[PDB]
């Protein structure tokens, strides 16, 4: 019954803004406690603020490397809870949700305040920082040999080098060839690049027959490569 | 974060496992624990003394003493293979929250695998432009969990790595990358270069060389 | 006002000692 949406997410440059939105319906959400929370890409949870219901007087702590330049606030009358973002820093990056913070404290055994539990959660909105412009993938061919090989199987790929912002879909064969073919994540450079590995296992008694071409696509750049790996 | 969890703990399908968290708050604070999946919302498992939202299944089951707060599964599911997290307050009597340092939950309920290690030396496209870029895959190994390391001659490679996090694959095994980025220079000026893979107590290693 | 819950865990912690 309890629905949860957040919204207004993307790419922005360090020192810049940003707003984002959530809307609850399903429950009282005049008198429920809310409460904003994120995950730095590849790092676990982060406890950022919370506002708290009328009774409080809809006061808001904030987290000490946040405070001073995020701000939080809330409209019952639509039901939209909003985190305003100021002088946004790379590390503020990626991911933000919204919870309903429910409100627990054992008369015998708690100590006040007591403590704070979330018993609903969103999908979230992903926020991404960095100073990075748009780049086209450089694609160098991981070709085949005696130091890649193994029985009569054999290892091919694509190097996408440097590209940026995500994502790049890379196929083989115009998509003619998916078995045997994985696309590795992405890693990302301290330059503030990515970069892949497209690889696919092939039999050593195909490569003079049959010719391989990974083809690699790029939106965000508008780029689209086709290159052929062949044998050293 | 003033709250200390386990970096990762295993267990086997079927059998209990308890998953401790550590801070000074504790002692006067209780703890909420979270499931977290790749790709997916939190969701509360248990807080307070002993309340246990609906819809969460029985086996899961809070407690604490002195500092330390724990959660035990006792009959652990293959789906219970996911991340977790304890919350509480940061300091004694403070209107603060915060998280732990997470614990992956390695439920083991595919068989271990070997991992297939295949390490690709600078196309000499790639030298042209002035660069060199070492390329060591791998793939179908079970749990997630390996040990990357880089080689020059038979010396550590300090600083220019940067290896991913293994990833599901199509089979529900896992896959990882890693990248040692060269100068030219660099590239031609050891004898050969290697790309240590440990996995569960094992070790594969493969080896490239300037020539041929 | 006695609908602040800080208010309210100190009211009711104090009836303890």
Same mark, same amino acid.
């Given at each position: 019954? &309890?629905?949860?949406?957040?919204? #207004?997410? !993307?790419? &922005?440059?360090?020192?810049?803004?940003?707003?984002?939105?959530?809307?609850?319906? !399903?429950?009282?959400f005049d008198n429920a406690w809310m409460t904003w929370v994120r995950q730095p890409?590849?790092?676990?949870?982060?406890?950022? #603020?919370?506002?708290? #219901?009328? #009774? /409080?007087?809809?006061?808001?702590?904030?987290?000490?490397? @946040?405070?001073?330049?995020?701000?939080? %606030?809330?409209?019952?009358?639509?039901?939209?809870?909003?985190? /305003?973002?100021? +002088?946004?820093?790379? /590390?503020?990056? !990626?991911?933000?949700?919204?919870?309903?913070?429910?409100?627990?404290?054992?008369?015998?055994?708690?100590?006040?305040?007591?403590?704070?539990?979330?018993?609903?959660?969103?999908?979230?909105?992903? &926020?991404? @920082?960095?100073?990075? %412009?748009?780049?086209?993938?450089?694609?160098?061919?991981?070709?085949?040999?005696?130091?890649?090989?193994?029985?009569?199987?054999?290892?091919?790929?694509?190097?996408?080098?440097?590209?940026?912002?995500?994502? @790049?879909?890379?196929?083989? +064969? %115009?998509?003619?060839?998916?078995?045997?073919?994985?696309?590795?994540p992405a890693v990302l450079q301290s330059s503030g690049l990515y970069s892949l590995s497209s690889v696919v296992t092939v039999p050593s008694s195909s490569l003079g027959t049959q010719t391989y071409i990974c083809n690699v696509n790029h939106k965000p750049s508008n780029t689209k490569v086709d290159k052929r790996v062949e044998p050293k | 974060y003033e709250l200390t969890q386990e970096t990762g703990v295993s267990v086997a399908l079927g059998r209990t496992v308890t998953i401790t968290c550590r801070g000074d708050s504790l002692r006067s604070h209780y703890a909420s624990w979270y499931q977290k999946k790749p790709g997916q919302a939190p969701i509360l498992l248990f807080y307070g003394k002993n309340n246990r939202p609906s819809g969460v299944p029985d086996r899961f089951s809070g407690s604490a003493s002195g500092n330390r707060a724990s959660l035990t599964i006792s009959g652990a599911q293959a789906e219970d293979d996911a991340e977790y997290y304890c919350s509480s307050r940061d300091k004694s009597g403070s209107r603060l929250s915060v998280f732990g340092g997470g614990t992956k939950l390695t439920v083991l309920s595919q068989p271990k695998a070997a991992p297939s290690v295949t390490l690709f030396p600078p196309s000499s496209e790639e030298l042209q432009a002035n660069k060199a870029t070492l390329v060591c895959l791998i793939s179908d190994f079970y749990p997630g969990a390996v040990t990357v390391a880089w080689k020059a001659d038979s010396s550590p490679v300090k600083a220019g790595v940067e290896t991913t996090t293994p990833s599901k694959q199509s089979n529900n095994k896992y896959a990882a990358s890693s990248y040692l980025s060269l100068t030219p220079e660099q590239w031609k000026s050891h004898r050969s270069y290697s790309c240590q893979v440990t996995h569960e107590g094992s070790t594969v290693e493969k080896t490239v060389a300037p020539t041929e | 006002s006695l609908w602040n819950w800080f208010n309210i865990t100190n009211x009711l912690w104090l009836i303890k000692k």
């Amino acid at each position: 019954e &309890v629905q949860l949406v957040e919204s #207004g997410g !993307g790419l &922005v440059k360090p020192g810049g803004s940003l707003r984002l939105s959530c809307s609850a319906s !399903g429950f009282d959400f005049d008198n429920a406690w809310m409460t904003w929370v994120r995950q730095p890409p590849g790092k676990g949870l982060e406890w950022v #603020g919370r506002i708290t #219901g009328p #009774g /409080e007087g809809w006061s808001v702590d904030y987290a000490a490397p @946040v405070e001073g330049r995020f701000t939080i %606030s809330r409209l019952n009358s639509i039901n939209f809870l909003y985190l /305003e973002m100021n +002088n946004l820093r790379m /590390e503020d990056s !990626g991911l933000y949700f919204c919870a309903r913070t429910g409100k627990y404290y054992d008369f015998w055994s708690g100590y006040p305040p007591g403590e704070e539990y979330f018993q609903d959660w969103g999908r979230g909105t992903l &926020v991404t @920082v960095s100073s990075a %412009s748009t780049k086209g993938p450089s694609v160098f061919p991981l070709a085949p040999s005696s130091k890649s090989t193994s029985g009569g199987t054999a290892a091919l790929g694509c190097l996408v080098k440097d590209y940026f912002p995500e994502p @790049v879909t890379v196929s083989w +064969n %115009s998509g003619a060839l998916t078995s045997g073919v994985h696309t590795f994540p992405a890693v990302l450079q301290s330059s503030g690049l990515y970069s892949l590995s497209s690889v696919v296992t092939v039999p050593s008694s195909s490569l003079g027959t049959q010719t391989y071409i990974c083809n690699v696509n790029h939106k965000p750049s508008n780029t689209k490569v086709d290159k052929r790996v062949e044998p050293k | 974060y003033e709250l200390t969890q386990e970096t990762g703990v295993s267990v086997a399908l079927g059998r209990t496992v308890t998953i401790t968290c550590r801070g000074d708050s504790l002692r006067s604070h209780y703890a909420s624990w979270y499931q977290k999946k790749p790709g997916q919302a939190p969701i509360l498992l248990f807080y307070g003394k002993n309340n246990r939202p609906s819809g969460v299944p029985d086996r899961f089951s809070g407690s604490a003493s002195g500092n330390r707060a724990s959660l035990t599964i006792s009959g652990a599911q293959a789906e219970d293979d996911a991340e977790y997290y304890c919350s509480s307050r940061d300091k004694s009597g403070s209107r603060l929250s915060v998280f732990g340092g997470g614990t992956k939950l390695t439920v083991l309920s595919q068989p271990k695998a070997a991992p297939s290690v295949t390490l690709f030396p600078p196309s000499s496209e790639e030298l042209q432009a002035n660069k060199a870029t070492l390329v060591c895959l791998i793939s179908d190994f079970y749990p997630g969990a390996v040990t990357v390391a880089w080689k020059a001659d038979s010396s550590p490679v300090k600083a220019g790595v940067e290896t991913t996090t293994p990833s599901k694959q199509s089979n529900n095994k896992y896959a990882a990358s890693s990248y040692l980025s060269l100068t030219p220079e660099q590239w031609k000026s050891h004898r050969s270069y290697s790309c240590q893979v440990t996995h569960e107590g094992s070790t594969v290693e493969k080896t490239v060389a300037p020539t041929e | 006002s006695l609908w602040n819950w800080f208010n309210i865990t100190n009211x009711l912690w104090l009836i303890k000692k």
